[PDB]
């Protein structure tokens, strides 16, 4: 069973600009583990599989969170550390193109449909329960948990937003964009790590290891 109430509870329980951004990401990696432990049945998976799912999904999970946090920011994002990054500052740091993709494909679309925190939490739990993650000991159990999440999300959307029958599908169809932006984010991060000119803290650095 997968009650949307517990998923919202997990969201609520955890509530060089590139250097600022990396610091915020490292801070939120610790909070991400706490969030994941509060998603129903995650902690019951084998420890190896919990590791695989969080290593595979952390960037999409954090991008979804800070994008939704930024709905009331004009042309920018709100970092977990309290700072804004405006698109002009992002451009000035050499990461303008991917930053604009976050604003246009995620933040503005979350703002336009007024995605709420239960929906964000369900989308993140779907991302977390990624049965394609390589090396999982039981992919079928992860797919089953994913199916429980989106069954609960759909019932929630249909009840709270009955005038928007397409809202459930509209939520899920942000996940390809999230995947693409996440992959590009990872490529930038591996390049920052290679160049050596950008401080990367211990947990973010660990996520960038083999």
């Amino acid at each position: 069973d997968m009650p949307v109430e517990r998923i919202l509870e997990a969201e609520l329980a955890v509530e060089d600009p590139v250097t600022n951004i990396c610091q915020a990401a490292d801070k939120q990696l610790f909070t991400l583990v706490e969030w994941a432990k509060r998603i129903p049945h995650f902690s019951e998976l084998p420890l190896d599989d919990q590791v695989i799912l969080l290593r595979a999904g952390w960037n999409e999970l954090l991008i979804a969170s800070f994008s939704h946090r930024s709905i009331a920011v004009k042309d920018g994002i709100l970092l977990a550390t309290g700072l804004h990054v405006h698109r002009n500052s992002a451009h000035s740091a050499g990461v303008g193109a991917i930053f604009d993709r976050v604003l246009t494909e995620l933040v503005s679309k979350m703002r336009d449909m007024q995605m709420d925190k239960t929906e964000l939490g369900c989308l993140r739990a779907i991302v977390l329960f990624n049965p394609d993650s390589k090396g999982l000991s039981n992919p079928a159990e992860v797919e089953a948990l994913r199916e429980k999440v989106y069954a609960s999300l759909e019932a929630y959307c249909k009840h709270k937003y009955p005038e928007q029958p397409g809202r459930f599908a509209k939520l899920l169809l942000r996940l390809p964009a999230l995947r693409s932006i996440g992959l590009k984010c990872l490529e930038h991060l591996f390049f920052f790590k290679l160049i050596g000119d950008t401080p990367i803290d211990t947990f973010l650095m660990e996520m960038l290891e083999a």
Partner: peptide, 9 residues
């Protein structure tokens, strides 16, 4: 995966 394991325990 050292930090991640420790935090999951």
């Amino acid at each position: 995966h050292k930090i991640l394991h420790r935090l999951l325990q």
